[PDB]
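Deviations from the work plan: none for this task. Representative record:
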Amino acid sequence: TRRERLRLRRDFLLIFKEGKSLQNEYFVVLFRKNGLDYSRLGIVVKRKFGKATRRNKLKRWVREIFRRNKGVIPKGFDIVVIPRKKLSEEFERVDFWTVREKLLNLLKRIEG
RNA sequence: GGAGAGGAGCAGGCGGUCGCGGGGGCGCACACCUGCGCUCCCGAGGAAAGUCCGGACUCUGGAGCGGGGUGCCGGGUAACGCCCGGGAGGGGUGACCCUCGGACAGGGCCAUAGAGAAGAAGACCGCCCGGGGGGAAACUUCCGGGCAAGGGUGGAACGGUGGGGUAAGAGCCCACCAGCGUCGGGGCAACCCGGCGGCUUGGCAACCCCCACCUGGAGCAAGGCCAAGCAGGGGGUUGGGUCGCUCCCCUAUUCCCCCGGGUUGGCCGCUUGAGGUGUGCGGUAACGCACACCCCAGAUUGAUGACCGCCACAGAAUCCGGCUUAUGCUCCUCUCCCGUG
RNA sequence: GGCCAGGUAGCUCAGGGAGAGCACUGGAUAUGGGCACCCCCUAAGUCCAGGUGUCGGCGGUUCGAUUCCGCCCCUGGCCACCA
Ligand SMILES: [Mg+2]
Ligand SMILES: [Mg+2]
Ligand SMILES: [Mg+2]
Ligand SMILES: [Mg+2]
């Protein structure tokens, strides 16, 4: 859903500068009110996370978590998900349910 | 069965619940441009990779030189540093694998060790002859002369080993060998086979070089178009005109250089191509030709996931040909070895 | 996707027969300290002695390669339109 896909080239700077942030050991989540009746997701994966296979797997998991849990995630925010060094350190050791739990714990705390 | 060499294919599938990317069809709104909404088709790789070669395709005004690349020979190909076949040299019992022009065109470099390393250089331990001296002798000593043959030195010592011949010795002579020169035969050829002959005189060109062949340079962020927006200023014996050098066609601010500020939108390029698959024919093969069938990702923060059930390596970004590296199986050949019918 | 750089003692940097600087380990000795000397402790310093390496890895050429020729690994940077 590309209507659900927020542009990062223009908006990342604005969200970084004007928005809020939440984090845990695996993710940093940046967010800002978008003035819409729905939320939009963006993913920023640092080059150092790895090659296409690895980065694309992470992005797919993130997109899926967001899509399936859209109903419970707060509405009216532009959201940027950023994986942390730790995650890229035990990514192969971290299962899907753990990534889901850790990401949702942050997403559900987006206020207000 | 064991050990090993060459090579071909596949990339866990099939049946379920949700979620994407591009086409098509449809539902509709269309006073235009177009704007959404919901089924059929297709949707990462053998390496998509590293960017090591070769193209195609774009933009830079000409030509020459330099520079760079390839390196036995013959094909194949759009082309290549690739592929196929063949020739020499080497390794392995063997199937097989690896190597590749020229050092009497020239210049330069060979440390250390060693008597001597490029004109033929050299006498270290030595071998033999002719005298003078000492000494009973063995032996020592001095001068004159002859050896590259043994040993030592090396990565290599100016042909190799055996016999004859030498005072002692040398291709001095002869044998087989290696090299070179020729004559003759077979190959398109690289080269091979046979005969004759003095006696022959380092290595490195992944150093410059010589010979033969090929070759501008950038690169899809190439380049073309639309929309949007701010703000200009300082320079040019001229400089710049898609690497350098040399001659040459230009152009004078609108061009180029520096500082500063505006976008950090959308469309084209963007996928049908030296393209796959299936036969038939030619060719040792690589591959070519003929006919038939097919449409096989085109994203632009960048599309393939999660749950269930019987059994790796890693993700296209302009597209192809090949190389190299990363990696899980399965099958087909042939070689040697133990053991049996 | 493409195009360039660079990888040397721990760190910064030189350059076809492996070095400087900071630095570390010792010995010397207070004008520091146990008290005041004797005796002894500690070395910021100052003397001196050195300690030391797959040349980013793995092959090839060469009798020898930091230098030459291949590939692989790691670390940085550059690109688009407007005027
Ligand atoms: Mg059996
Ligand atoms: Mg690539
Ligand atoms: Mg000799
Ligand atoms: Mg440009």
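The domain at 1-112 of chain A is CATH 3.30.230.10 (Ribosomal Protein S5; domain 2).
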